[PDB]
Amino acid sequence: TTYKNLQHHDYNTYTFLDLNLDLSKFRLPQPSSGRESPR
Amino acid sequence: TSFGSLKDEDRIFTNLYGRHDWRLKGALRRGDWYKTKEILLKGPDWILGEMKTSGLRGRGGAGFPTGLKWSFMNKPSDGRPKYLVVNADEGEPGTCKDREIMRHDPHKLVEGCLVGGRAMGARAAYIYIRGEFYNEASNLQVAIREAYEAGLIGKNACGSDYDFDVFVVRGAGAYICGEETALIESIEGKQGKPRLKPPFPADVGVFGCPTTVANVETVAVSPTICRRGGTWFAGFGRERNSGTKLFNISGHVNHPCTVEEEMSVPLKELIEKHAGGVTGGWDNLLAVIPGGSSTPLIPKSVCETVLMDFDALVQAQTGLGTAAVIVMDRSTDIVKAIARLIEFYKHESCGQCTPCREGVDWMNKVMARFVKGDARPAEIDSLWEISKQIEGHTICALGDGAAWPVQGLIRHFRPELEDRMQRFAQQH
Amino acid sequence: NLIEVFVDGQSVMVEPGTTVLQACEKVGMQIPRFCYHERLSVAGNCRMCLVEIEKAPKVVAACAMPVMKGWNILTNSEKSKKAREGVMEFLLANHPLDCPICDQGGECDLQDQSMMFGSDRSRFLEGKRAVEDKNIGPLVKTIMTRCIQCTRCIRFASEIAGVDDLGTTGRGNDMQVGTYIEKMFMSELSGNVIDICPVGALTSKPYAFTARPWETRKTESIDVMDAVGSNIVVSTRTGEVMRILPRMHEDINEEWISDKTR
Amino acid sequence: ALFVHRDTPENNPDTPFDFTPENYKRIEAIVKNYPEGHQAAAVLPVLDLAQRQNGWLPISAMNKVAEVLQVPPMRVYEVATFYTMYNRKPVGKYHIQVCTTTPCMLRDSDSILETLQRKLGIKVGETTPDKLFTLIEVECLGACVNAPMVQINDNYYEDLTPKDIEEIIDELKAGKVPKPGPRSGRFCCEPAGGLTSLTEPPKGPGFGVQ
Amino acid sequence: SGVNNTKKWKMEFDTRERWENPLMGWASTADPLSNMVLTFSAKEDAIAFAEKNGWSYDVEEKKVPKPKSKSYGANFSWNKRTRVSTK
Ligand SMILES: Cc1cc2nc3c(=O)[nH]c(=O)nc-3n(C[C@H](O)[C@H](O)[C@H](O)COP(=O)(O)O)c2cc1C
Ligand code: SF4
Ligand code: SF4
Ligand code: SF4
Ligand code: FES
Ligand code: FES
């Protein structure tokens, strides 16, 4: 018939990160290693 | 049986050619997300038994039974959480399959990640892809946005009380990162450099937390297996080589292609049935690369009459890998081809193993000399001995990947090299 | 709690979380070494610690592998010796011919391991490589077309001196080891990478070009620069001091001493 | 190539660089994808981000990232030298790169590479004096079937010949944002002309179920 | 990193005057024994020889390394501090 996935030709160089920014509201709290960092 | 001759009703990765929609709607229509809740109820052990009954094997690299690979991790927890990782990376020359799977079937991939995490009592799935596939990562992130907003993912998975998370990651343009351990290290930020087995990611690994690795095709098919029965699936393949498979035919062909097919199928039938036929005439065919760069060639005498599966390729002295069937004819410098194939590794070897770092370049230089014949024969046996030195004395399979091609080239096509050398000597 | 092994028939009792190499040490047979130093972390870069494991085909690396009850180890066997031959052919593929100039001329672990466990010539009729040299301080003369890339300096720094400035920059033969800039790696403990780098890449500038080991009459003494008690080896030459070295005391200085005293 | 840093007047720690407030928003959102502790995974995408904010990655950017993530900066330098996409030397407007690996090669990446070199007048390993197009030859990219292909900034362009690439090149020298995809009739990956699979529609949700 | 030297037990003498010749600059000695290094396989036998020849012996006992547990996997840990930032 006709190719259908043509909804990215307009995807600029920030869309992935904007989407990450949006999803970070729907994510769940990450675990805590009970630490600041391993230095 | 004469395997192959498949039905597009059993062919799984529908929308392959993107002729349909790749959103949640078209997916539910195709048959995605069907009673996943009942599956989560049934729980892990049933899923693992289903996969074992199916007898499935792995796509990426050698065939390691997924049932056992995952039972390794099926276990209680000790505060240390458990993670899954998806090796969306695709750099192995001749492979254009996971990219399609993603830009045209992302919901099924998410479904498979969810099922696997449930099987392993996981918490989340990190999908690591390359950097060049920005469009694909974008489409996939959009599908995940839809999934979250619907409710098929997150705190309440699909109606149960299973808390699962999905995260996506891009690399930066490397290939080694497609290895079970340096993948993890790149994720953590450390250089894309592997580790030593033991220990194994199935007990120790990412963030010092147990985890499992999986290929996109395997994770995407496991749910269809679970919801169709497994035995039916296995019926489409030999005892050990069970299952369908994705193939990527490229090189000297009228119409290169990506295809879905059955396992243990004749290569000749595969090439001459799809692809519109081999270029210039079959007889012009010289040799093949049935597994990409990670496998050695085979000439006419076995390119014809052979099957296609891990076994019956091993017997043929080779492997399968990703099913990246390259084909050539009597019009190319096999030597130049393979020399570029090895310069690939000389450019994309991490470097921490001495034999890799200091033998891959040796090979590249000696093959660049072979190109023009400015050498003398016994360097042939020297190179063969170097390959046998490298094979097992490394960490990642890339050592074997760099040796095997040369081993095959020199077990098959020695007289070409000898004649090149005598001719160059003649020319002075 | 103990665990058993049968090396060359010979039996041994060890603990878990152990290593093939520590077992072979308990027995006496020394195993080769390029990326191992009991006072450091572990890696598998060099790939010269390989052995054979009876009843299992594939070789392993005795610096990382933990010993499993019932294994018969084989050190001086065919596959092992062949692995070592190949590995040293690889290393010496590019190690330039600066053995004379190299202040680490008579103490070169690599010299000795080639003379003993390696082979008798090179099958390398090809070209070599080189690399730029770095300024790293007025103490540590750096040649870097000799680094076999063992990472001893990297691990020693990132663990002991908490410096966190050294590291590897690149992949493939083009790899290097050293900061990405002209920074200075000066610290109270800078001055042991010399003793740790088996090769003469990170040499000492003062001692350099002054003498060689075998000429020396290594006497033994201690330090006074501090009140610690660092056992020391004082090297002489025709009735004069030429260099100072640490001396292994598992309590006080443990194979490490101070820039000042050395 | 080079894996070393000489402080030129354009590339020095005092070089101008800074992370915008919305970039900081994205930073926080990212780092909240990983655990408390082990918060270094931000490195790779953070550097890709700084690259997208300015095509090239300078010493100052590396140091800023390391100070943001509270990490030793050598663990940034290592990565920037390890991975390729991280441009450490300035880049022009279009970061063109062409596959030369065996399949693309034997399906003639050489002719198009030659025509591109002749067209832009410049050779691989450099760019125009106006600093517009930077050409490179590289290895596989996932288009090993639509073999003769390229990458430009983020998109591919496949199954193409010298005429096609010359057309695209003048089109890009004009201020155009072309449509990313093949340019030989084929749509995405199918066998040109006709098909043999997915011809019939799919079946229903409940099928072959236990 | 060699350990086929720390196997024996060696007898040496204290040092003595070691000056410079005025003519050219060589190093001379009044004592012949300075370069008399002797080997043994046991402290008891060495002591027997020493007290037999009548000298005044002083010992330096054995400095032996310790055993250690190199749980490599620990480098890639989660809660610990051993976690390295390199590879
Ligand atoms: C050097 C190397 C590169 C690899 N690259 C890829 C890749 O680009 N894409 C992919 O799908 N698998 C790749 N693999 C396959 C991996 O081995 C695989 O992701 C994993 O290790 C095994 O997973 P599996 O058992 O489910 O197949 C690569 C393997 C190796 C050794
Ligand atoms: S074999 Fe080569 S690519 Fe693999 S880990 Fe070792 S050095 Fe890196
Ligand atoms: S470290 Fe020095 S002595 Fe040893 S091989 Fe290299 S140059 Fe020769
Ligand atoms: S400079 Fe010396 S210590 Fe550091 S990695 Fe190289 S060989 Fe090892
Ligand atoms: S000592 Fe084992 S690989 Fe270096
Ligand atoms: S053959 Fe060119 S992208 Fe793989």
Summarize the model shown.
This is part of a larger assembly, with chains A (39 residues), B (428 residues), C (262 residues), D (210 residues) and E (87 residues). Chain B is of the alpha/beta class and 428 residues long. Chain B contains 18 helices and 9 strands.
Strand order within the widest beta sheet of chain B: 6-5-9-7-8
Give the largest interface pair and sizes: B-D, 79 and 62 residues
Separation of the first and last Cα atoms of chain A: 57 Å
The assembly state of the depicted protein chains is part of a larger assembly
DSSP helix fraction of chain A: 10-25%
Extended strand count of chain B: 9
The fraction of residues assigned to DSSP E strands of chain A is under 5%
Strand content range of chain B: 5-15%
Largest sheet of chain A: none
Helix/strand-derived category of chain A reads: mainly alpha
Helix count from the secondary structure assignment of chain A: 1
Helix and strand sequence of chain B: HHHHEHHEHEHEHHEEHEEHHEHHHHH
First-last Cα distance of chain B: 57 Å
CATH architecture of the domain at 24-235 in chain B: 3-Layer(aba) Sandwich
Computed CA radius of gyration of chain A, to the nearest angstrom: 18 Å
How does the helix and strand content of chain B classify structurally? alpha/beta
CATH class group of the domain at 24-235 in chain B:
Alpha Beta
- Cα shape of chain B: globular
Quickly count the helices of chain B. Answer: 18
Percent of residues in helices of chain B: 40-55%
**Helix/strand order of chain A, N-terminal first:** H
Membrane topology (chain B): Peripheral membrane protein
GO molecular function, one term (chain B): 4 iron, 4 sulfur cluster binding
Binding site for FMN (chain B): 170-218
Protein name (chain B): NADH dehydrogenase [ubiquinone] flavoprotein 1, mitochondrial
